[PDB]
Point group: C2
Chain length 216, copies 2
């Protein structure tokens, strides 16, 4: 039974993990007979967004407490993740990826990544285990790995430019396909960077999870 | 495309809509070539639960603002739902169904259902449009319709008895099947009342969505 670590960043596209992407990732893992082992950093969200209006709210929420809603409570602090107990790592998207897992949303090419996440992904890569990042999550890759990688965030020219400025080789990719850095076993897919509906998002995520499991 | 109204009650199993059930419902609607039209009542949730610990929190949240998370902002107040603009209605589960869409959680067989939801369900049924309820959501049916209905919440002995006490014909049903009251076009399935994992929940939910869509066609 393969164990796939799934890293969340809250519960909702604007301040945490993209709910559809996280649930579709869990569905693909389950359908394939693998076990999803979910984590999230135990810290306060950088903000709380009203998803009906798009505006910031005057309240505070904890990343892990909120991410527990997506997993029905089956989640642990990211501090408890151990690369030796996992076969693959997948990071769904959502703005939380650029706000809580890193500060890419505010720093761009000068951002930094959550230290527990960075250490975990580096340990996974040193053991030859596959990583899967989607939507805006791939933007952290050039800050986790100090070596070039072929990746994709879809087709957005400005975002693509920022990734190239960070040293990555951006590869344009439609919503129903993936980009793989074969030598480093890193799989990326655009998901909601381009998906026009949930079925579209699911086609790319299903392909990403499948490739990650094969690599595992 | 058929317009399928999806009613949400918050964002999370313990104090709103079951997130996997709501997303799997949207996935099946979208994959089947139909259009999801989402709503939630604009009112404060009865409670806020820390899903890591299961403990009640000392904060308050709005059902609609939280349900907007599941729908990427694509949702309206339940007051704006118009039966004439919809072809079918589906209510995902989660404890929010028993707390925000009704007070089944605290009143059981003496509960009442959100007035807007009841009215919208009655209007759809009067027009011969199908309804789909899953998990604990079918517990509201005896309080929406004043005639016996064939439905299921799975196999829970206690809950089944409460439904029979409310006048329903409770039909034991596994996670991968559905129960349909054919004369009234009502489709129910257990989802997380029994699912052990998300693939199991998806199996029953896809069957319910497919039957609702056939009934709407």
């Amino acid at each position: 039974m393969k164990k796939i670590g799934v890293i969340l960043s809250g519960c909702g596209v604007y301040d945490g993990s993209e709910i559809h992407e996280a649930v579709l990732t869990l569905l693909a893992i389950s359908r394939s007979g693998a076990q999803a082992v979910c984590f999230a950093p135990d810290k306060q969200q950088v903000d709380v967004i009203n998803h009906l209006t798009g505006e910031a709210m005057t309240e505070t929420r904890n990343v892990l407490i909120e991410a527990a809603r997506i997993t029905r409570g089956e989640i642990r602090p990211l501090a408890q993740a151990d690369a030796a107990e996992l076969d693959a790592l997948i990071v769904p998207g959502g703005f939380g990826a650029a706000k809580n897992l890193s500060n890419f949303a505010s720093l761009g090419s000068e951002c930094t990544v959550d230290r527990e996440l960075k250490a975990l992904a580096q340990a996974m890569h040193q053991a030859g285990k596959p990583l899967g990042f989607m939507c805006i999550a791939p933007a952290m890759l050039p800050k986790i790995f100090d070596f070039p990688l072929r990746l994709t965030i879809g087709t957005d020219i400005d975002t693509a430019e920022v990734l190239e400025e960070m040293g990555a080789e951006h590869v344009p990719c439609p919503v129903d396909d993936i980009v793989v850095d074969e030598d480093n076993k890193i799989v990326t897919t655009p998901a909601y960077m381009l998906a026009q509906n949930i079925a579209e998002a699911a086609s790319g995520i299903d392909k990403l999870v499948s490739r990650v499991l094969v690599l595992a």
